[PDB]
Amino acid sequence: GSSGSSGKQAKIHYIKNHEFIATFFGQPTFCSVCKDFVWGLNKQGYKCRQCNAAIHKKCIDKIIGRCTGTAANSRDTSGPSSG
Ligand SMILES: [Zn+2]
Ligand SMILES: [Zn+2]
After folding, report:
1. CA 3 centroid distance within chain
2. Which ligand has an atom closest to residue 35 CA?
3. How many angstroms separate the Cα of 37 from the Cα of each of 25, 50, 62?
């Protein structure tokens, strides 16, 4: 019944207005930038816990755009709609 507790290191990358959080893809996921297998040589990549965009640690500097699963002020927008 009893249990313990301990801190947890959590680092987020505010790149291209994203939340890419360091994650280990035990399986060859389908990247969004290059769209590679994302597996092989012992290494990890990146995955946005907001829009769920899995990319390579290097593809992060290639990304061309912004995040969608983010709530920020709306100064100008063609046709916004949320609730
Ligand atoms: Zn990639
Ligand atoms: Zn995102």
Report:
1. 31
2. 1
3. 10, 22, 17
**Ligand with smallest separation from the Cα of 30:** 1
Q: Which DSSP helix (H) or strand (E) runs through 45?
A: strand 45-48
Phi, psi values for residue 12, rounded to 5°: -120, 140
Half-sphere exposure at residue 23, Cβ-oriented, CA atoms within 13 angstroms: 20
Cα distance between residue 42 and residue 68, in whole Å = 30
> Which ligand gives the minimal distance to the CA of 48?
2
Q: What's the 10 CA to ligand 1 centre distance in angstroms?
A: 23
| Solved using | NMR
Its CATH class, for the domain covering 1-83, is alpha beta
